[PDB]
Amino acid sequence: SETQHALGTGVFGGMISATILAIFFVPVFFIFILGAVEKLF
Amino acid sequence: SISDVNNAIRENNVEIAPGRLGDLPAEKGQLITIPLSAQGQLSSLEQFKNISLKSKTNGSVIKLSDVANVEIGSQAYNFAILENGKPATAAAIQLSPG
Amino acid sequence: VEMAQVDVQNKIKAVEARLPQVVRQQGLQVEASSSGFLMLVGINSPNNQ
Amino acid sequence: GATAKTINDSVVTLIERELSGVKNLLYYSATTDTSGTAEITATFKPGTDVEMAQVDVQNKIKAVEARLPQVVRQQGLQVEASSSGFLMLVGINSPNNQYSEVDLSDYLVRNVVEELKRVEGVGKVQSFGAEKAMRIWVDPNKLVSYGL
Amino acid sequence: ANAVKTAEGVRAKIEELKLNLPEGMEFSIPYDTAPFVKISIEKVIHTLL
Amino acid sequence: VITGITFAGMKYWPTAFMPEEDQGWFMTSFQLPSDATAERTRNVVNQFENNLKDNPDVKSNTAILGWGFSGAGQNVAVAFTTLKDFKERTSSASKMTSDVNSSMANSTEGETMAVLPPAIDELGTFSGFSLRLQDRANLGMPALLAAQDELMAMAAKNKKFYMVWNEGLPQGDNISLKIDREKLSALGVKFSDVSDIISTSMGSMYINDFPNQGRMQQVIVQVEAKSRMQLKDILNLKVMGSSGQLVSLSEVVTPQWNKAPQQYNRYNGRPSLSIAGIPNFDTSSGEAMREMEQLIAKLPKGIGYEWTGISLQEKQSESQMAFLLGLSMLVVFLVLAALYESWAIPLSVMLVVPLGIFGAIIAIMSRGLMNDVFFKIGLITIIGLSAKNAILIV
């Protein structure tokens, strides 16, 4: 169970972190990234 | 004869082999085992000078210095070096091809 | 150079037995060297000690 | 039959000097004990081909073979590729105590060891027993008594 | 090399040599790591399912 | 803020390489003082056998007396203890080794070290950190032995280390016989006779072969055991003199005792000593290695160290992490930019990755595991999956 735990727990947690928190963040990045490129040009 | 001198040199400087007290197979109840060595070689000029030879004509005991001169010289006397008209030693370095 | 040296060693390995006993005891040395001298490095005694 | 220091001074250093220069060599080490045998190991980078490494090591050792003492040269240098651990242990035992340990070791060495080495995948077989031999245990007091 | 195949070959050779073994002699394999090479794999495959 | 937390967590959390696993067997090594004979080693091996006989878990226990993975002699032994199947077994190998070490640390006269199978098949024979402490400035063997003794004491005082020991053959005493050549000449005894009698007293001599049931076998002549156990027997040897009266060796030999290292180990062309250790419970391999190097910093000048086996691979794995992460990020950046021919989209996809790193680090802190290679694989996987979610939207 040691190897399985080591391989699994990190990916398990990182998956919830990438799902619950990204759905709200990546749109926020898209917003104001095009704003930054407008500011440059 | 010179064969006698060579033989005496070989016998006096013999390089005795090492051993181990308590080596297997060992007697029952043996608790201590220890290596043992002996120095059968000569490590001084005077020791070689004092190597004993037996005279054939009379049987008397003589020493190596009696029929020879023992010194510390060089293995070979083939080459010499002169750096600017002065004695010295030197070696040459050859680079590997390529 | 290395390939030639190893080939020479392999080729001479066969002839080792046929040589006199003294030469076999002394051994055969195979090397790759330049024709001359890259440098000379020497030791001198200025005070003749 | 020589002390570890003798072999270390005479043999190990000369071998390692040339051995140090092999391709894809992660490192190397040497060990000398009272048994009279010295073992020099060379550990190569992971993923390197074992066959190429062994032939390279053989080339480099034959490069430095000449300078070693005469007796060790007569005995010869053994170069081999092996793992660091035992895959398995094969044993012979007498349930009824009919055969002694020496007989078991002799049977192991004479027959089973060679057959096991014949099997594919068996890199090395290390035997912890010795074949039979004739042994003459001499009493020094009796020898000197007769002047021999 | 493969531990499992080598162990299987060694066991087959031992079985072959048992027939010629003298009476009062017995073979054994007290220590072997090949058997553990399989069960672990099973677990992983089982987990996969 | 989340990116900063991810960076801090990745930086400061302990590290390891592989997780421990149970393989149903363990290995015990017995090392006894230099003067120990075969019987003394056999007694401790029999004590170990007796202590493991009652334990239900063990199914087989083979002991090899006279051979060890590090050094060979009459004071070394190695045993392989096999355990029953996991389900029937009601104990782990780690607890078995701990119990063996605790029990055998007082009763026996030698050091017994029970260890688990190596994490990887051919990366060593133990499960711990292996070190080579070497002399880089020609200090000498006695200096190296003093340094190893100091290091052993320092590691013993430390709590991060469970047991730190040295693998090899201990230093031992030796006897040298000095021959009075002048007295030999005075008594008429010829030196070659003394040399021959000394040489053949304690060695096996191979003479010739002889047919035994169709096989060639060796004829070996050696002195009887009873006459080669103690130095008195060696000094009792007699040689004829000129006057026809035997002279014993004791008359013309003086014994002298010294202490020298029996085994010589060398690593990377330098005199070296092999040391081993196992991290204590709740401590990681990286912590143990860091503490070991910090301790070595306190050792005298001219003494260096190098990591070998699993430790070196762990060092390489932990050095390369940042470069691999950066290259994976660059690869995904270029691939996304080429596919969608824009700069904003790939950068927006990159920014998410720290979010997944946050989750991974918090999960491995919550469960208490370490930053091993499997965690690195998981991190690089979460990179791709977070990029997969960011792409699916943007």
Residue numbers in the entry:
A (entry chain C): 987 to 1027
B (entry chain A): 199 to 296
C (entry chain A): 100 to 148
D (entry chain C): 51 to 198
E (entry chain C): 297 to 345
F (entry chain C): 544 to 937
Relevant lines from the article:
In A. baumannii, the best-characterized multidrug efflux system is the prevalent Acinetobacter drug efflux ABC (AdeABC) tripartite system. This efflux system is capable of mediating resistance to a broad spectrum of clinically relevant antimicrobial agents, such as aminoglycosides, tetracyclines, macrolides, β-lactams, fluoroquinolones, chloramphenicol, and trimethoprim. Each subunit of AdeB contains 12 transmembrane helices (TM1 to TM12) and six periplasmic subdomains (PN1, PN2, PC1, PC2, DN, and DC).
Three distinct conformations of apo-AdeB (AdeB-I, AdeB-II, and AdeB-III) were captured in our cryo-EM data. However, in the AdeB-II structure, it is observed that the organization of the AdeB trimer is packed in a way that can be interpreted as a dimer plus monomer configuration within the transmembrane domain. The region that maintains the assembly of the pump in the trimeric oligomerization state is the periplasmic domain, where the long-arm feature formed by subdomain DN strongly coordinates with the hook-like structural feature of subdomain DC of the neighboring AdeB subunit to secure intersubunit interactions within the trimer. This region also contributes to form a hinge so that the transmembrane domain of each protomer is capable of shifting toward and away from each other. No lipid is observed to associate with the third AdeB protomer. We suspect that the switch in configuration of the trimeric AdeB pump from trimer to dimer plus monomer and monomer plus monomer plus monomer can alter the interactions between the AdeB pump and AdeA adaptor at the protein-protein interface, in turn facilitating the transport of substrates across the periplasmic space of A. baumannii.
